[PDB]
Design a protein around this ligand. Structure first.
Ligand SMILES: O=c1ccn([C@@H]2O[C@H](COP(=O)(O)OP(=O)(O)O[C@H]3O[C@H](CO)[C@@H](O)[C@H](O)[C@H]3O)[C@@H](O)[C@H]2O)c(=O)[nH]1
Ligand SMILES: O=c1ccn([C@@H]2O[C@H](COP(=O)(O)OP(=O)(O)O[C@H]3O[C@H](CO)[C@@H](O)[C@H](O)[C@H]3O)[C@@H](O)[C@H]2O)c(=O)[nH]1
Ligand SMILES: CCCCCCCCO[C@@H]1O[C@H](CO)[C@H](O)C[C@H]1O[C@@H]1O[C@@H](C)[C@@H](O)[C@@H](O)[C@@H]1O
Ligand SMILES: CCCCCCCCO[C@@H]1O[C@H](CO)[C@H](O)C[C@H]1O[C@@H]1O[C@@H](C)[C@@H](O)[C@@H](O)[C@@H]1O
Ligand SMILES: [Mn+2]
Ligand SMILES: [Mn+2]
Lengths: 288, 288
């Protein structure tokens, strides 16, 4: 459940947070609208695990594996079992055009997987851009009845380290690993005013990923519905945003500020970007 | 309103938050449970003003002025007009045993004041400790119908600088100005196991004030009800916590983590503690 009566935490022994010591001085850990930016060293996972277990939190994870991308499911799911929300209730929703190609993966207790068959689109960009519709339109009643939060990710990825309840909040985006140190003028936002995804050069907080976002079911429904509607407008106007769904997600999060922002620990490409000092953990990474 | 459909922010021009620059490196700006700690330089008030105005947020401010403390009302209210939630809807609730001693203070538009008459208790500690009852028991229906957030403060104080929507959240406490740099063993928590307010020497995050707390109406009701019940238990057991309501508030916030923590900018005593470098603003201060 979300927003139900919260029982008392039990006694816990852990290090005192010291006000005149930040652990992290090398990075911004809170946005100017007072949303935490989630980096290693900013959270005590034992406290968070307590808070979310006391709510009997259920997390839905959506992943699309259409056409050749079914090959990525085994590693995705097996590593999610090792690292994603372990100890909490998890419901995986695998959207595919090939139900029989979904690997038989052994799940820990309190975890379930549903295979949802969908149509395959011919163009790569329609496959990637139509996920907003599939999440909002077709699955709205399902998700509202079955989970408290939704986490929506790309499949060509593996978990290498803890991804847990520290991410959960009404609405979150993830800092793109290519651009976290860039100034806003260099962000690859949609720059044509004819697109609903247009962001002027003097606007923008961060460059967020299309590949890792989430929140409460209600907020994820809102985001995906708004992005779908905006993509339909662009289509009717004969324009396709430069980075597809990612461009629309950026416009949405500019105008609807996320209540947490995930650091690039949460979606990294080691082959392309290495392992910088400012990354203490690589949690979820692109498959080479 | 809280938690209603959030309209889009308008275009805004403001400095980009840079991920590899914290403004504040001298202080902890997020708790280990991912609640922001509110210091100057952590928030863009223009963004926050937008978000809360788009919700037509109404803030209730409670203040007790019993017996000789009515003398503090003029300065309290006049300075609140200059600095507290300016531009937002505000409802002051002044609890007093002397309605005719409440000064006639001129209010800005969209701001109102209600005088609530209460009984005066003979002991200083009963006056201070009975506010939990008065906030919860008698005023619950009133507040739920009239405001979105409640801010509950001591009266022997004045506003000197901005106190605004950056503080608003489901539940907040304020770091006591005497103890923000102390280790937890030095905190003046109730240490007798016979009191409901008991906190062992190896527990505790922060030392919070009895004099400045708040949150949503629902969360403030929960806090004040729980503290009132705990104080009644202690009374029945013939024990009175060392720092009265403040001791019980500390126990509650240990077991129910606040969703924001206010820095000591928000309740300071300059005569006793001066003006440290780590305080960029003194917002709300003790009257000498
Ligand atoms: O034939 C396809 C094509 C796409 N997908 C799904 O769509 C995702 C996105 O495609 P991908 O090839 O992973 O895109 P990338 O170029 O790796 O990532 C960019 O493009 C994605 C789609 O716009 C965004 O989610 C990312 O943030 C952005 O960095 C995939 O992981 C799959 O889950 C399929 O299942 N089958
Ligand atoms: O005769 C009284 C006594 C108390 N009060 C009210 O209660 C408040 C608390 O009393 P105060 O004398 O301000 O207590 P302090 O010793 O200044 O403050 C400590 O005691 C308060 C009561 O426990 C806590 O709120 C503070 O956090 C704590 O630092 C006052 O400001 C008034 O609002 C009255 O109106 N009349
Ligand atoms: C400046 C250097 C940029 C380095 C990363 C660029 O990544 C690409 O960014 C695009 C937006 O500008 C869009 O999100 C696609 C993204 O490429 C994907 O993600 C990378 C991190 C790699 O995994 C790459 O193979 C993948 O296509
Ligand atoms: C260590 C040095 C402590 C300095 C401040 C002590 O303040 C007092 O703390 C008590 C809890 O230990 C309790 O909250 C009362 C508090 O005293 C009040 O607040 C101070 C900041 C002063 O304004 C003082 O006059 C007032 O009584
Ligand atoms: Mn990918
Ligand atoms: Mn006082």
């Amino acid at each position: 459940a979300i927003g139900e009566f919260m029982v008392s935490l039990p006694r816990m022994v852990y290090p005192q947070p010291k006000v005149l010591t930040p652990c992290r001085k090398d990075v911004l850990v809170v946005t100017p609208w007072l949303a935490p930016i989630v980096w290693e060293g900013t959270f005590n996972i034992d406290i968070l695990n307590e808070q979310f277990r006391l709510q009997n939190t259920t997390i839905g994870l959506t992943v699309f594996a259409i056409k050749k991308y079914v090959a990525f499911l085994k590693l995705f799911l097996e590593t999610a079992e090792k690292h994603f929300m372990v100890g909490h209730r998890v419901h995986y929703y695998v959207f595919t055009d090939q139900p029989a190609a979904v690997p038989r993966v052994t799940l820990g207790t309190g975890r379930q997987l549903s295979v949802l068959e969908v149509r395959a689109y011919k163009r790569w960009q329609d496959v990637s851009m139509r996920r907003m519709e599939m999440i909002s339109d077709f699955c709205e009643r399902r998700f509202l009845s079955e989970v408290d939060y939704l986490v929506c990710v790309d499949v060509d990825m593996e978990f290498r380290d803890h991804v847990g309840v520290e991410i959960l909040t009404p609405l979150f985006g993830t800092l793109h690993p290519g651009f976290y140190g860039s100034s806003r003028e260099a962000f690859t936002y949609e720059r044509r005013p004819q697109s609903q995804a247009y962001i002027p050069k003097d606007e923008g907080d961060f460059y967020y990923l299309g590949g890792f976002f989430g929140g409460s079911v209600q907020e994820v429904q809102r985001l995906t519905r708004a992005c779908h509607q905006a993509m339909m407008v662009d289509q009717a106007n004969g324009i396709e945003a430069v980075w597809h769904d990612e461009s629309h997600l950026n416009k949405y999060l500019l105008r609807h500020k996320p209540t947490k922002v995930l650091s690039p620990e949460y979606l990294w490409d080691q082959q392309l970007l290495g392992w910088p000092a400012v990354l203490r953990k690589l949690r979820f990474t692109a498959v080479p």
